[PDB]
Amino acid sequence: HHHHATNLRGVMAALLTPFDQQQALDKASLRRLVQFNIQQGIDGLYVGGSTGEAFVQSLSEREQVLEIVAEEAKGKIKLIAHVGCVSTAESQQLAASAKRYGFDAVSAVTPFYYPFSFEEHCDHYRAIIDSADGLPMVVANIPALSGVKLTLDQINTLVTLPGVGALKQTSGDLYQMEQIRREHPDLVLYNGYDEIFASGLLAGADGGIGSTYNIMGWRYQGIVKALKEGDIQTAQKLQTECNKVIDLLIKTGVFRGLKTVLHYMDVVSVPLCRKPFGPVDEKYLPELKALAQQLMQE
Amino acid sequence: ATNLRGVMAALLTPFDQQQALDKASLRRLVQFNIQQGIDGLYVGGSTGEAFVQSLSEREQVLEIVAEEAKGKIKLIAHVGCVSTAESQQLAASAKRYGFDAVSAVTPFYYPFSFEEHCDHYRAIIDSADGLPMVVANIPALSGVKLTLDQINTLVTLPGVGALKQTSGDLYQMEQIRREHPDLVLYNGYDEIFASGLLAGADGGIGSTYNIMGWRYQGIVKALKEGDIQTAQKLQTECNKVIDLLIKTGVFRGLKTVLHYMDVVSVPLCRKPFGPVDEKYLPELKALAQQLMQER
Amino acid sequence: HATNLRGVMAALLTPFDQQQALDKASLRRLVQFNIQQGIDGLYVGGSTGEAFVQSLSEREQVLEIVAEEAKGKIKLIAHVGCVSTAESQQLAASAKRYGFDAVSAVTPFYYPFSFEEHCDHYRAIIDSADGLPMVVANIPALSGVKLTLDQINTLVTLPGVGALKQTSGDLYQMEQIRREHPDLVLYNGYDEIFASGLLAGADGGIGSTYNIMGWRYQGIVKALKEGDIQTAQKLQTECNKVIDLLIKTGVFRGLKTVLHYMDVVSVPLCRKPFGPVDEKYLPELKALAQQLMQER
Amino acid sequence: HHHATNLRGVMAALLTPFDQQQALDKASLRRLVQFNIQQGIDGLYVGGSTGEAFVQSLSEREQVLEIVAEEAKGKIKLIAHVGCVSTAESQQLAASAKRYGFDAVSAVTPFYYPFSFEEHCDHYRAIIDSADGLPMVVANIPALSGVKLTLDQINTLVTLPGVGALKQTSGDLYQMEQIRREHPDLVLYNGYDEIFASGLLAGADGGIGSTYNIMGWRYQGIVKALKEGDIQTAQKLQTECNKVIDLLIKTGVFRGLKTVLHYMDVVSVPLCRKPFGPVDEKYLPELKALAQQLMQERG
Ligand SMILES: CC(=O)N[C@H](C=O)[C@@H](O)[C@H](O)[C@H](O)CO
Incomplete structure (x- = not known):
């Protein structure tokens, strides 16, 4: 039974990590972006995730973000720390830091690059969970970036690791989504792919975690409500x-395209991703500007 | 191709004990399908085991289904072969037997360019002589890895009137619907039917509809009425x-269920497919019984 | 004692005509052309031979003709493989009637089949060939079937399997297979690695390009045996x-066009849905033919 | 590519040994370096995938680069694998290795996030800038990174200013030959040990590998075999x-090689960093034997 992490369910923005033209952390844009999310009416933030550019950051720089975010939002909203690295030891330290700063859960993407066994994947989550010292885990399953395809049985076994009470399921398999839900009727189950949120909710997901929620997170809230009310047509x-x-x-690059629109909404000073992510192309700037305006009026 | 919209059963081809066509079980299975209230039949498809059948065999199934159901339901003829000329031969015959549409899975095995693929469909469309084309995108089987731009061009070929989307990618499903608002769009994976309609499918084609097409019609109804829980x-x-x-093998497992439901005399597929494993038989009867209660 | 199937063996092309019917006259030529090149034998009606855009009957008339032109002069493997066991079985007995030396089959495709189902498919074609050695044909790029080494090891040990056509680029596996089966007849399937496939432990080859330049591939076998590496x-x-x-041209229509300027194949067409050769490639294929004729 | 000919040869992919608490076992690293020179290795590829880079901080990677300079500068060729996801991090590692006097730097194509091809080019370019004269060895490792380069994409990357070499870890020997035929003077390393001979037949003029840490001499033995034209020996x-x-492969390649390295008492603790678990129990018999076999035939 997954009633232990039931408080973690809902729509959660995957926090983007802002930087300057020096490629340093821009901390005033982070604060600005957090508060912006909080006032959109988001249920929480997922910090230092893929959308967060965590794998172009040092552990120190991840800790500094973790710390600021909690200072800004702890008790206002649910806060989830993506602590995952390839190394178990790196992931535990981050997991220890998130605890210190008062996060509500920790999360880790399946470790990547080296092809670790399933056994080696489970020991890893157990390690972080223990270092989390009371914070429940969100297993992150994003096969298209990690190259770790998980089966149902494997997934089943991970989300019943003791201390786990949630799954970021960034997978377009909406059959697997229903099986997870049919099998784990209590489990918090985050639809992961923004562009299938409605269908994902229909298949048994009870919320989400996504990149695009930083710029129109109320629209996703509307989808949850519209389907709880039987208004499929508005969903x-x-x-x-x-x-x-x-x-x-997708055309402009997801995270930097998001960053750019946040720039025009007066939230992020410099809309850059860290190298080797290049700049957005100037030809999309008119359409990202027009979008910034459409979304502020809404 | 407006009136092609709906819940269409991907008809299984029945075989006798010696693995020839079972004409009796077949006729039984078609009527059994009409009973359940299906909107139509997709004849000689992947589910139909067309790729372990001769052209004349595929034509024999085709003529016989039209005879059982023409007028009563919509009938779509999957005439797809690896060969353009073979494919054309089945299109010409669907025409003759009075079918409503033809369909075709992307030619497989040999890498064919998108240009050649496009040409494949124009030939079959001309040989179908006024019968609208159903494009079948079934990448898990064919290995043809089609994009949106590619799909957009196939479905907007003159003659094309519908897409069978056997893809799990419900972003693309929503994407296709938005570019082509008039397109007949058939969710192809039974196991996401509800989620697929929600993303923009307007009907479906499926193998499991042969044994519970009413549950799919119930999902179209419940959604229509805002009835989210029920769907x-x-x-x-x-x-x-x-x-x-899936544990039993979709095609022969269906066939057995229909064996226990009095429709199918012998529940075998064609080799290289093997028998259903005997441990599973009880549950397939259990399911036969339970589904026979239901309707 | 199927070690007499060892050799360089051209994956024969199946000429068609203007209207896509078989071109039996150009076919008889191509058989005799191949015999001139010092080819050890022919692999008939495989994937190179546009098997799967032909009827069983067309495939049968090709096999017959080859057996008319070549039986007892070279070796002859008949590719009889189909998705249907029963249809593959029609083709093998037919291959047995025409006096072929061997049958072959690609892993049945389109539908996934369990590995148990594959062995039975092989087991059954073997019965229908009635004593002809079976060449199991592993072609992942086209078939979509992904055999493991244990599954390959199982397939070559089935009664009646004499050889393996290994159209993989994985030459770790090529070596692994040789090590498990020192007397296995092991054909290299990708022509673009032939020499490196021999070094890994193939003892011959099967390939579409042997049709136009098989003697080079015999040049390579010799070279290696000579220990001459620069030549190889x-x-x-x-x-x-x-x-x-x-590969720029599309290999099958490319080969037919080289042979068409070698005035051997009458019309250079593969069957639809294949298209003809991009018009703007003709000068190269012309020169290459002139080139290759001057060479032989 | 002329400018880098001196980098041709058989280079061991240097493992990074750790103590019972997963720290840099510094004395063991020093021993492995000398063991490789005492094998007759042409050079050392340091901080690569076999070197367990991505379970290490920049600090630890820099320490290994630092130590190996001490042991191997002026004795054998030294290539530092400086690649990370983030460019800025790789650039730090690339200046470091220039400071320590390495002969060349190398980066595997940046992974996890899917970067466009221009973005890969710029990254080598900016890592090159930091190496400030040191040649770049581009490292193509599809199995691990998940980045699949087309032949033209490879051709463009190996002719970026400052690139002299390619670690081609890919069993596609057609491509190997195309790479050779397209750049006759490029230093083309065979990356997959299980196809070294055939790799060297297709156009590779050397190698970088993980198993060389326990049997280099065989791989050099293959080079000579093929120079002589003795395919029987090759x-x-x-x-x-x-x-x-x-x-x-059965045991775990990197942990396997560290275990044989224990039974030559070259390495103190044979562990890889978590989430690499330990080698299984049934496999210790074969590896001991294997170590003893490998010592006995060494002399
Ligand atoms: C066509 C194919 O998949 N395989 C052929 C037979 O193995 C090969 O010989 C190729 O035709 C040739 O090597 C081109 O890749």
């Missing part, structure tokens, strides 16, 4: 609108 | 069944 | 120079 | 190398 209406914007972001 | 419940019960069938 | 590397690199162009 | 060695690689 569809909202998903379509979300996906015209995801279409744009 | 999810109805999708869930389908997935408990597909769970099993 | 030059020949391989020369084959890869041609293969580079055949 | 084949025999390649076969023996693959019998061991067969075993290491």
Whole structure:
């Protein structure tokens, strides 16, 4: 039974990490972006994730973000720390830091690059969980970036590791999504792919964690509500609108396209991702500007 | 191709004990499908085992289904072969037997360029002589890895009137619907039917519809009426069944269920497919019984 | 004692005509052309031979004709493989009637089959060939089937399997297979690695390009046996120079066009849905033919 | 590529040994370095995937670069693998190795996030800048990184200013030959040990590898075999190398090699960093034997 992490369910923005033209942490843009999310009406933030550019950061720089975010939002919203690295030891330290700063849960993407066994994946989550010292874990499953494809049985076994009470399921397999839900009726189950949120909710996901929620996170809230109320037509209406914007972001690069729109909304000073992520192309700037305006009026 | 919209059963081809066509079980299976209230039949598809059948065999199934159901339901003829000329031969015959549409899976095995693929479909469309084309995108089988730009061009070929989308990618499903608002769009994976309609499918084609096409019609109804709980419940019960069938092999597992339901005389597929494993038989009867209660 | 199937064996092309019917006259030529090249034998009606865009009957008339032109002069393997066991079984007995030396089959495709189902498919075709050695044909790029080494080891140990056509690029596996089966007849399937495939432990080859330059591939076998490495590397690199162009052209229609300017194949068409050769490639394929004729 | 000919040869992928608490076992690193020079290795590839880079901080990687300079400068060629995901991090590692006097720097194509090809080019370019004269060895490792380069993409990367070499860890020997035929003077390392001979036949003029840490001499033995034109010997060695690689694949390659390195008492603790677990129990018999076999035939 997963009633232990039931408080973690809902729509949660995957926190982008702001930087300057020196490629340093921009801490005033982080604060600005957190508060911006809080006032959109988000249920929480997922910090230092892929969307967070965690794998172009030092542990120190991840800790500094963790610390600021908690200072800004602890007790206002649910806060989840993505602590995952390839190394178990690196992931434990981050997991220790998140605890110190008063996060509500820790999370880790399956460790990547080297092909570790399933046994070696489970020991890893147990290690972080223990270092989390009371914080429940969100298993992050994002096969398209990690190259770790997990089966149902494997997943099943991970989300019943003691101390686990949630799954970031960034997978387009909406059959697997239903099986997870049918099998784990209590489990907090984060639809992971913004562009399928509605369908994912329908298949048994009870919220999400996504990149695009930083710039229109109320639209996703509307989807949850519209389907709890039997208004499929508005849920569809909202998903379509979300996906015209995801279409744009895909063309421009997702995280830096998001950053750019946050720049025009007066939230982020410098809309750059860390190298080797290049700059957005100037030809999308008119469409990212127009989008910044559409979304502020809404 | 407006009136092609709906829940269409991907018809299984029955075989006798010596692995020839079973004409009797077949006719039984078609009527059994009409009973359940299906909107139409996709004849001689992947589920149909067309790729372990001769052209004349595929034509024999085709003529016989039209005879059982023409007028009563919509009938789509999967005429797809690796060869353009073979494919054309089945298109010409669907025409003759009075079929409503033809369909075709992307030619497989040999890498064919997108240009050649496009040409494949224009030939078959001309040989189908006014019968609208159903494009079948079934990458898990064919290995053809089609994009949106590619799909967009296929579905907007003159003659093309519908897409069978056997893809799990419900972003692309929503994407296709938005570019082509008039397109007949068939969710192809039973096991996401509800989620697929939600993303923009307007009907479906499926193998498991042969044994519970009413549950799919129930998911179209419940969604239509804002009835969210019921659809999810109805999708869930389908997935408990597909769970099993995946353990048993979808095609022969369906066939057995229909064996226990009095429609199919011998529940075998064509070699290289093997028998259903005997440990599973009880649950397939259990499921036969339970589904026979239901309707 | 199937060790007499060892050799360089051209994956025969199946000529069609203007209207896509078989071109039996150009086919008989191509058989006799191949016999001139000093080829050890022919692999008939494989993937190179556009098997799967032909009817069983067309495939049967090709096999017959080859057996008319070549039986007892070279070796002859008949590719009889289909998705259907029963249809593959029609083709093997037919291959047995025409006096072929061997049958072959690619892993049945399109539908996934369990590995148990594959062995039975092989087991059954073997019964229908009635004593002809079976060449199991592993071609992942086209078939989509992904055999493991234990699964390959199991397949070559089935009663009646004499050989393996290993169209993989994985030459760790090529070596592993040799090590498990020192007397296995092991054909290299990718022509663009032939020499390196021999070094890993193939003892011959099967390939589409042997149709136009098989003697180079016999040049390579000799070279290696001579211990001459520069020659073996030059020949391989020369084959890869041609293969580079055949992939720009599309290899099968490329080969038919080289043979068409070698005035051997009457019309250079593969069956639809394949298209003809991009018009703007003709000068190269022309020169390469002139080139290759001057060479032989 | 002329400018880098001196980098041709058989280079061991240096492992990074750790003590019972997973720290840099500094004395063991020093021993392995000398063991490789005492094998007759042409050079050392340091801080790579076999070197367990991505379970280490920049600090620890710099320490290993630092120590290996001490042991190996002026004795054998030294290549530092400086690659990270973040460019700025790789650039730090690249200046370090220039400061320590390495002969060349190397980076595997940045991974996890899917970067466009321009973004890969710029990254080598900016890592090159920091290496300030040191040649760049581009490292193509699809199995691990998940980055699949087309032939033209490889051709563009190996002719970026300052690139002299390519670690081609890919069993596609057609491509190997195309790479050779397209750049006759490029230093082309065969990355997959299980196909060294065939790799060297297709156009590779050397190698970088993990198993070389326990049997380099066989791989050099293969080079000579093929220079002489004795395919019989080339084949025999390649076969023996693959019998061991067969075993290491079963055990875990990097942990396998660290375990044989224990039984030559070259390495103190044979562990890899978590989430690499320990080698299984049933495999310790074969590896001991293997160590003893490898010492006995060494002399
Ligand atoms: C066509 C194919 O998949 N394989 C052929 C037979 O093995 C090869 O010989 C290729 O035709 C040739 O090597 C080009 O890749």
